[PDB]
Amino acid sequence: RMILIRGLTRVITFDDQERELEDADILIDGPKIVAVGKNLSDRSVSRTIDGRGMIALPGLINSHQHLYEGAMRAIPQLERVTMASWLEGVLTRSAGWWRDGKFGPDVIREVARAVLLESLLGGITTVADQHPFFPGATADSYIDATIEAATDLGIRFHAVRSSMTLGKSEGGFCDDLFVEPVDRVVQHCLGLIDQYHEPEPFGMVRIALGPCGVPYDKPELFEAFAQMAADYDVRLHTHFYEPLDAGMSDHLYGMTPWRFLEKHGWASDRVWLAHAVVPPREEIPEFADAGVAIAHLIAPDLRMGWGLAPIREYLDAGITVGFGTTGSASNDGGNLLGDLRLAALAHRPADPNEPEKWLSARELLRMATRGSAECLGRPDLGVLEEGRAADIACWRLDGVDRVGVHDPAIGLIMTGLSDRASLVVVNGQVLVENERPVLADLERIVANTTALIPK
């Protein structure tokens, strides 16, 4: 009862040798890839899928979503704002809607269902969601809602439990009722691991631990989480060197955000860090030696006016770099592949006479697959080879908008009227085919969710 994808025009593996293949196949057994190569046997195969005219990649992995923000897209007052106005805007709406019973757990479930379905249609097979800018998150069964939506759809899912534990009063940056006692956060997290965490290879739901950041959480939370990570082999995540962070840190602790993390147990290989826009250059070698990973988030970095993270420098230092979209209040889409084009182009003017420093299409596609898998600590994902999860995303190459394309991988980044995936498989299950959801009722999900968006 295996599945064979036959005759793929191009296969990008991102294996240890960066192999690519032409007119080749992928054989799938249950949740696992059996083989990648030419003329594989359809012996034990119960189904053969025609891959001709398609390019196949590992499933894309979005290492940074804020699903609840799907209901906050294209709001005119938030179109052109800097971080302070943006943050205030999002925090007030999530707090206001919630208090008025417009943002119940069931509203978040359906918003998550739409953004995760959009994610599948964009070739994204794993999503890591966090909720730093929705205070009522825990007081309303919000991670249970998102996990319910993800499992219904069959998308692989990492739920990052976030918080803002440093109160506006005692030095913080938060309305003193988005604040939870450290032990309360810890205990909620422990319960989530018990209930949902799937640590085995090919696990479909995992829990990670994600304070909002140095300006937002108590050092006691960072240390408690560092302990939990070792205890339960889960991952640690936080925001990192956003503009102004360095000053806020120096003010609270008289040290850099990095020095702070190192002091509280987060300078380790269990850690991935969001944005990393403006670190002191002299700290980059330390990032590398500690083995932290970094998620590049081009859309919000441009949207906020933050600018260009030193990604080339990170790769030069051998640091793991993944990719993410962040929430749809700062993007405002969940289109990861589309955002790769933004990064491909926007980094270039920074080095006008040194094109060798510009990020390539292949470097970017890697970030969105293997790089993100490494950020989430998933050695079972992000690569097309025997033994890895059968998480696969394919795009058609034969459309009128891709005529004259000479290199299909570069083509995926540099051409097209549409980033819609043709064929998407997650955990060996076909979820999208011919650009359409196989199991999900698209029109009904749109109808249901739209009715629930706070008016």
- Give residues 183-222 in contact with a second copy (rule: CB under 8 A): none
Q: Does 417 bind a second copy (CB under 8 A)?
A: yes
Window 337 to 376, contacts with a second copy (CB under 8 A) = 338, 341-342, 345-346, 348-349, 351-353, 355-356, 358, 360-361
70 binds, among Zn ion, a second copy, none (CB under 5 to 8 A by kind): a second copy
Only one of the segments 27-35, 286-294, 305-313, 381-389 lies at the binding site for a second copy (rule: CB under 8 A); that segment is: 305-313
Which residues bind to Zn ion, rule: CB under 5 A?
326
User: Does position 333 bind a second copy by CB under 8 A?
Assistant: yes
- Which is nearest to 222 in space by CA: 254, 268, 290? 268
**In sequence order, what DSSP letters do the residues of 253-304 get, joined into one string?**
HSS-HHHHHHHTT-SSTTEEEEE--S--GGGHHHHHHHT-EEEE-HHHHHHT
Q: Which is nearer to Zn ion, 49 or 90 (CB)?
A: 90
Q: Which residue is nearest to Zn ion (CB)?
A: 326
Q: Which does 342 bind (CB under 5 to 8 A by kind): a second copy, Zn ion, none?
A: a second copy
> Cα separation of 105 and 50, whole Å?
41
Question: Cα separations (Å) of 227 from 230, 292, 407?
Answer: 5, 17, 47
Candidate segments 176-184, 232-240, 310-318, 447-455, binder of a second copy by CB under 8 A: 447-455
Asked if the bond preceding 194 is cis, omega within 30° of 0, the reply is no
**Alpha-carbon distances, residue 283 vs 198, 276, 279, 448 (angstroms):** 35, 12, 7, 48
What tokens were used for 255? 């040290």
Query: Judging by DSSP bridges, how do beta strands 45-50 and 54-58 pair with one another?
Result: unpaired
By beta-carbon proximity to a second copy, the closer residue of 85 and 92 is 85
290 binds, among Zn ion, a second copy, none (CB under 5 to 8 A by kind): none
> Which residues pair with residue 425 across a beta bridge?
392, 430
Distance of CA 418 to the CA centre of its chain: 20
98 near a second copy, judged by CB under 8 A: no
Per CB under 8 A, the segment of 37-45, 66-74, 225-233, 312-320 that binds a second copy is 66-74
> 223 to 282, contacts with a second copy by CB under 8 A?
243
Give the footprint of a second copy on residues 110-169 (CB under 8 A): 111, 114-115, 117-118, 121-122
Among 185, 297, 299, 309, binds a second copy (CB under 8 A): 299
Considering only residues 411, 425, 426, 427, which one is a binding residue for a second copy as defined by CB under 8 A? 411
208: Cβ–Cβ under 8 A, 6 or more apart, which residues?
A: 128, 158, 159, 160, 161, 234, 235, 236, 237, 376
Tell me if 401 contacts a second copy by CB under 8 A.
Answer: yes
Asked if 57 interacts with a second copy (CB under 8 A), we say no
Quote the longest CA-to-CA distance of the chain.
67
What minimum distance in Å lies between the beta carbon of 146 and a second copy? 15
DSSP label at 4? E
Q: Find out whether 66 is annotated in a ligand binding site.
A: yes
> Could you tell me how far CA 72 lies from the centroid of its own chain?
18
Residue 239, annotated as binding a ligand: yes
Ligand-binding annotation for 264, yes or no, is no
Q: Which stretch binds a second copy (CB under 8 A): 69-77, 180-188, 247-255, 379-387?
A: 69-77
Measured from the Cβ of residue 263, the count of other Cβ atoms closer than 10 Å reads 14
Q: Which of 228/329 has CB closer to a second copy? A: 329
# chain residues binding a second copy, by CB under 8 A: 76
Distance of CA 275 to the CA centre of its chain: 12
Integer-rounded Cα Rg, in Å, for the chain is 21
Tokens of 191: 């319960």
Nearer of residues 296 and 388 to a second copy, judged by Cβ: 296
Extract the tokens encoding 217.
């959480």
Return the range that interacts with a second copy (CB under 8 A); candidates 31-39, 72-80, 178-186, 256-264.
Answer: 72-80
* Residues contributing to the annotated binding site: 64, 66, 239
* Residues contributing to the annotated binding site for Zn(2+): 64, 66, 239
